[PDB]
Amino acid sequence: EVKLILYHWTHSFSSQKVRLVIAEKALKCEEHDVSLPLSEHNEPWFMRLNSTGEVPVLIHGENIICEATQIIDYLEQTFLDERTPRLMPDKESMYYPRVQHYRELLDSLPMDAYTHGCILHPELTVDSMIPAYATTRIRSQIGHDNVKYLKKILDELEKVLDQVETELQRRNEETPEQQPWLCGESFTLADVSLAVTLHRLKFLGFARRNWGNGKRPNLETYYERVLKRKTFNKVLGHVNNILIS
Amino acid sequence: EVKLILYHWTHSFSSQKVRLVIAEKALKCEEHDVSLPLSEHNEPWFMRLNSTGEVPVLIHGENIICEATQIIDYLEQTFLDERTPRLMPDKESMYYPRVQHYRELLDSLPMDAYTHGCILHPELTVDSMIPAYATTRIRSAYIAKQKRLKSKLLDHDNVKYLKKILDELEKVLDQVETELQRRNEETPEEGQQPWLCGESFTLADVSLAVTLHRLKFLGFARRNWGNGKRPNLETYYERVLKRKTFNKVLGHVNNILIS
Numbered sequence: 001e002v003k004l005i006l007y008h009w010t011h012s013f014s015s016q017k018v019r020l021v022i023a024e025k026a027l028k029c030e031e032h033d034v035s036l037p038l039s040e041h042n043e044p045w046f047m048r049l050n051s052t053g054e055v056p057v058l059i060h061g062e063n064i065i066c067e068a069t070q071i072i073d074y075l076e077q078t079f080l081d082e083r084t085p086r087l088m089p090d091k092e093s094m095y096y097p098r099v100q101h102y103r104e105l106l107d108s109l110p111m112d113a114y115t116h117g118c119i120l121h122p123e124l125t126v127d128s129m130i131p132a133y134a135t136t137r138i139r140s141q142i143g144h145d146n147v148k149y150l151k152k153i154l155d156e157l158e159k160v161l162d163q164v165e166t167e168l169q170r171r172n173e174e175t176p177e178q179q180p181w182l183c184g185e186s187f188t189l190a191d192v193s194l195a196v197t198l199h200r201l202k203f204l205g206f207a208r209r210n211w212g213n214g215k216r217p218n219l220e221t222y223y224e225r226v227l228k229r230k231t232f233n234k235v236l237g238h239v240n241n242i243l244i245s
Numbered sequence: 246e247v248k249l250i251l252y253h254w255t256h257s258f259s260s261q262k263v264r265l266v267i268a269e270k271a272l273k274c275e276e277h278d279v280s281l282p283l284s285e286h287n288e289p290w291f292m293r294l295n296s297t298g299e300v301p302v303l304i305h306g307e308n309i310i311c312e313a314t315q316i317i318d319y320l321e322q323t324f325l326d327e328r329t330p331r332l333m334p335d336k337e338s339m340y341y342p343r344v345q346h347y348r349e350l351l352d353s354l355p356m357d358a359y360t361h362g363c364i365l366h367p368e369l370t371v372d373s374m375i376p377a378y379a380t381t382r383i384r385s386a387y388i389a390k391q392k393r394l395k396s397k398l399l400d401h402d403n404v405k406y407l408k409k410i411l412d413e414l415e416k417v418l419d420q421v422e423t424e425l426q427r428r429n430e431e432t433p434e435e436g437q438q439p440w441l442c443g444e445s446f447t448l449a450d451v452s453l454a455v456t457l458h459r460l461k462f463l464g465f466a467r468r469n470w471g472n473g474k475r476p477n478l479e480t481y482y483e484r485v486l487k488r489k490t491f492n493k494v495l496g497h498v499n500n501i502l503i504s
């Protein structure tokens with residue numbers, strides 16, 4: 001009788017975290033993807049990745065909530081039925097600080113700057129999933145964006161992923177052969193931030209410099225496991241496929 | 246073919262500005278009032294004024310826009326058909342500075358704090374349209390001294406705050422009264438009168454009209470106009486009540502008999 005309504009863009013980074021939370025909490029939601037296959041300039045989704053500074057919006061009865069973080073906090077606070085999974089420990093738990101620390105650390109990453117850098121300076125990527133012609137078109141209609149800045153924030157990204165790799169190492173040492181996620185046994189909001197972040201870095205071609213082939217092996221094992229998680233696959237299994245509008 | 250969709254609360258101050266803009270631009274819009282006649286605690290709308298910190302949202306094609314100011318800017322920038330009224334002068338107009346100045350001056354008013362203050366400190370109102378029982382519901386030996394004291398201090402601070410912003414509100418309305426005086430002096434007394442900034446109804450008039458109507462609802466009208474005080478403002482308020490768009494959109498929003 002009281003619908004959950006979400007208006008969103010399928011390929012928006014924000015929308016992906018919201019929809020993965022909806023799936024992990026097993027909620028029924030009427031989801032409206034308002035994006036078009038082709039823009040006014042007949043550009044496809046992969047050339048419009050931060051076209052605007054606009055947010056998804058949730059309508060739930062009387063409540064209208066904008067922005068992924070606020071929507072996700074609303075969802076965690078509202079759906080308290082016993083059979084609805086929680087994605088945060090209680091605020092008085094000693095585990096709350098760890099989950100909130102990693103959620104905030106990952107949500108602070110400038111994903112918009114990585115995407116413009118992938119397109120502007122593809123020489124800094126390996127196996128970018130964005131066609132090369134996107135690069136030559138954005139650089140033409142030009143003729144903040146500097147190589148200096150982008151190399152700086154890619155190194156800052158390395159320091160965040162070092163902290164994550166260390167945390168995942170502590171999980172491995174604690175755990176025999178039911179494997180834990182980033183912060184503990186439960187899949188949490190820090191895991192949706194991490195999983196959706198890694199999948200987008202993969203899309204941008206910033207996966208191989210940060211993990212794989214012996215580098216950050218715990219992170220690589222985490223990424224491979226996330227891809228198989230049924231909720232992640234059901235919600236995000238195609239969001240990296242440029243053949244699908 | 247491309248619908249305008251608005252989700253909003255009818256009695257929300259923000260929603261009122263957005264819906265008045267939609268009416269003044271003559272746009273077709275699918276409007277969803279998500280407010281309930283009765284809350285879980287069987288309270289009606291006039292006991293839930295700023296219940297939460299939430300905004301209206303406009304969906305238009307691929308665009309999702311939240312908050313009244315951003316929605317209104319989007320509407321002004323997007324609907325450019327020749328027959329669609331403009332509520333802002335062109336950015337190169339000699340009028341643009343004056344409309345933008347009054348729009349931002351009125352949009353800077355802390356309407357939420359006037360609402361909180363009307364309910365918590367009704368002794369500072371005259372002819373509040375909110376029943377007195379809404380006040381008594383919100384207000385509902387050893388360390389009983391401490392909390393008697395702690396509560397007395399926040400009460401002291403909260404009255405001080407409210408008196409401070411009511412004096413700031415007077416200075417805004419003084420500027421508006423002076424502006425409307427210039428309009429009167431410029432215009433022959435017989436015939437059609439301009440609005441706040443000139444002949445056309447603008448975004449500054451939207452902000453002013455909806456602000457005055459809410460001040461009336463809260464009982465902050467009699468200290469600010471009427472009985473010889475700010476007579477240009479009083480004439481403006483009585484005129485905007487008769488404007489067809491304002492009456493069609495907002496004619497009952499102050500009536501607590503209507504759910």
Ligand SMILES: O=C(O)CCCCCCCCCCCCCCC(=O)O
Pocket residue numbers: 437438444445446484487488489490
């Ligand atoms: O003029 C009305 O009361 C609204 C009628 C609805 C149709 C739209 C007319 C737009 C009017 C633009 C500004 C004109 C000011 C009229 C002021 C007055 O006559 O008191």
